[PDB]
Amino acid sequence: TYKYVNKKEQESEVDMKSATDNAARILMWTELIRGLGMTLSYLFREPATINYPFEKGPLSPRFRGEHALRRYPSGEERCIACKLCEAICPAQAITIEAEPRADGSRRTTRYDIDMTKCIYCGFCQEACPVDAIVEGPNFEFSTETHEELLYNKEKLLNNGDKWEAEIAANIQADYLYR
């Protein structure tokens, strides 16, 4: 099914009434007045502006923000250096090295995320089998240098220790959809 957007060409004769209405519309700018009415009506509407940074835009638990590395409730790292996140990373933003820890544990010695390569796609956190790497809720981490956005393992673990309380609560809210 289709409709015409501009086929109103049922040409008809013109009375004095309609000719005068057409004349009034041209000479008195009536449709231009309707435009002013619309902008006037917005003048008296409450604006949609929020008072950033005292107010914030709404977000959801799924929001993909700054990365972090998480722990188990004991403090043990969750990451076991499987490299699934590194393999899937569409930007090759992740670089990992690992070796047996002093207690024999399978753990990383390098876990880097180039935040200026990363596309914030969340594929790493889907691929992680142990919920180790996550994108947290933080989006306010702009820096004054490029180098500050090349995160190493210490930075990423500090983000985890910094943001776990909110990260844990967001995972509790969404994990049944995953």
Sequence-distant (6+) residues with CB within 8 A of 27 are none
Smallest gap from residue 46 Cβ to other proteins (A): 8
Q: Is 48 helix (H, G, I), strand (E, B) or coil?
A: coil
Q: Which stretch binds ligand SF4 (CB under 6 A): 26-34, 51-59, 76-84, 145-153?
A: 76-84
The torsion angles phi and psi of 16, rounded to 5 degrees, stand at -65, -40
Contact between 123 and other proteins per CB under 8 A: no
Sequence-distant (6+) residues with CB within 8 A of 98 are 81, 83, 106, 107, 108, 109, 110
Under 8 Å between Cβ of 123 and 94: no
Task: List residues bridging with 107 in a β-sheet.
Answer: 99
Q: Which stretch binds ligand SF4 (CB under 6 A): 9-17, 27-35, 42-50, 128-136?
A: 128-136
Contact between 127 and ligand SF4 per CB under 6 A: yes
Contact between 133 and ligand SF4 per CB under 6 A: yes
Q: What count of other Cβ atoms lies within 10 Å of the Cβ of residue 127?
A: 16
Contact between 68 and ligand SF4 per CB under 6 A: no
Residue choice 14, 18, 19, 21 for contact with ligand 3PE (CB under 6 A): 21
**Residue 53 preceded by cis peptide, ω within 30:** yes
Q: What is the DSSP letter of 111?
A: E
Residue choice 61, 71, 82, 139 for contact with ligand SF4 (CB under 6 A): 82
Q: Which stretch binds ligand SF4 (CB under 6 A): 19-27, 34-42, 88-96, 136-144?
A: 88-96
Contact between 40 and other proteins per CB under 8 A: yes
- Selection from 89, 69, 78 nearest residue 135 by Cα: 69
Cβ proximity to other proteins: between 1 and 74 the closer is 1
48 binds, among other proteins, ligand SF4, ligand 3PE, none (CB under 5 to 8 A by kind): other proteins
Q: Is 100 helix (H, G, I), strand (E, B) or coil?
A: strand
> Could you list the residues that contact ligand SF4 (CB under 6 A)?
79-85, 88-91, 93-94, 96, 113, 118-124, 127-128, 130, 132-133, 135
> Could you list the residues that contact ligand 3PE (CB under 6 A)?
21, 24-34, 36-37, 40
